[PDB]
């Protein structure tokens, strides 16, 4: 077999139709924000995966 990307898949979950964020959900109601390709799930997928980067320890430092 083959893999398209060799190791590029995280196993966490997401659900973008739940949140009530007052900085992006109100920001996407404007005209020029939509026109550059912006939607809510791309920003949430950008920030939530960054919120889980690096859950390690200080034992893994030597």
């Amino acid at each position: 077999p083959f893999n398209g990307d060799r190791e590029a898949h995280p196993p966490f979950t997401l659900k973008g139709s739940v949140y009530n964020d007052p900085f992006i959900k109100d920001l996407e109601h404007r005209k020029e924000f939509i026109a550059s390709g912006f939607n809510t799930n791309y920003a949430y997928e950008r920030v939530l995966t960054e919120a889980f980067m690096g859950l390690g320890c200080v034992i893994s430092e030597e």
């Binding site: 083959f2 398209g4 990307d5 060799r6 590029a8 900085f23 992006i24 920001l27 005209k31 020029e32 924000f33 939509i34 026109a35 550059s36 390709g37 912006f38 939607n39 791309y42 920003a43 950008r46 960054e50």
Partner: protein, 290 residues
């Protein structure tokens, strides 16, 4: 490393050296002290490690300038423009596209834009793995309220939202460029040329179509859509004419990659599994490239 030989590059911004297997890139420091496009190109290429984006062995300081390292062999642009039709649509069109999209996805999952994609930016290696480099106008994907720049990518490889003037865009502008790399690779011609002007918008409308209100919405919010009139989008009679050297599944992800819709543009996580590499034949990295 402290090794030098003969120089490449007649540009006044930077003249790259060579030596050892590596290539020393020097930014002339001698307004501001250090330019934006020196720290802007070291600060994201330092932190990426991949077999499709080149890396830094050492970034040792010069007396006045900044030294980097690079790769030895030439680029994808000299491959396309001067050959005797070595490149064949069974296997040579698939492996390089797969590796460039692997590099683009590694840039994307680090949330780094890399808005300078050209065949003279994509460079090969002695084992033939194509690399993604020259992060000169790259940027991290910022907060959504932050205003970005405009003219960030070159003319022949420009996303149509950047033609229209999108000030604060997403990272889907660099899938359009590698789709034009796909078409430039399977057509062996400079795809979508412009006459050093705003004529890139008219030739993009003539090639792939003036976007309509029903389909890519909010395109009239740029103060540029009212300047011109509508053009017909191409139908599937393009399968034989002007694209006869192609497969059945190549046009599917080509048309999904040359969507002028940026929200519905196929991201690399759904371009690496777009059932085009699953079709026979399997690719292989030994290719007859000098």
């Amino acid at each position: 490393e402290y090794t030098k030989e003969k120089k490449v590059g007649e540009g006044t911004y930077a003249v790259v050296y060579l030596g050892c297997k590596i290539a020393i890139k020097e930014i002339k420091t001698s307004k501001d002290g250090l330019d934006m496009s020196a720290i802007r190109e070291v600060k994201y290429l330092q932190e990426m490690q991949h077999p499709n984006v080149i890396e830094l062995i050492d970034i040792f300081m010069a007396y006045d300038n900044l030294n980097l390292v690079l790769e030895f062999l030439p680029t994808d642009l000299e491959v396309v423009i001067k050959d005797k039709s070595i490149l064949f649509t069974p296997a040579d069109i698939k492996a390089w596209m797969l590796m460039t999209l692997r590099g683009v996805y590694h840039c994307h999952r680090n949330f780094i834009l890399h808005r300078d994609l050209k065949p003279n930016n994509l460079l090969f290696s002695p084992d033939g793995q194509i690399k993604v480099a020259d992060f000169g106008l790259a940027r991290a994907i910022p907060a959504p309220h932050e205003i970005l720049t405009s003219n960030v990518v070159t003319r022949w490889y420009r996303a149509p939202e950047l033609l229209f003037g999108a000030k604060h865009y997403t990272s889907a502008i660099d899938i359009w460029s590698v789709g034009v790399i796909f078409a430039e690779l399977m057509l062996r011609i400079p795809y979508l040329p412009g006459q050093n002007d705003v004529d890139q918008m008219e030739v993009t409308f003539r090639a792939l179509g003036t976007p309509t209100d029903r389909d890519w919405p909010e395109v009239s919010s740029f103060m540029t859509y009212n300047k011109l009139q509508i053009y017909p989008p191409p139908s599937r009679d393009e399968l034989r004419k002007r694209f006869i050297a192609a497969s059945e599944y190549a046009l599917d992800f080509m048309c999904g990659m040359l969507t002028m819709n940026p929200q519905k543009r196929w991201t690399a996580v759904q371009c690496l599994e777009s059932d085009y590499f699953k079709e026979l034949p399997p690719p292989s990295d030994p290719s007859s490239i000098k």
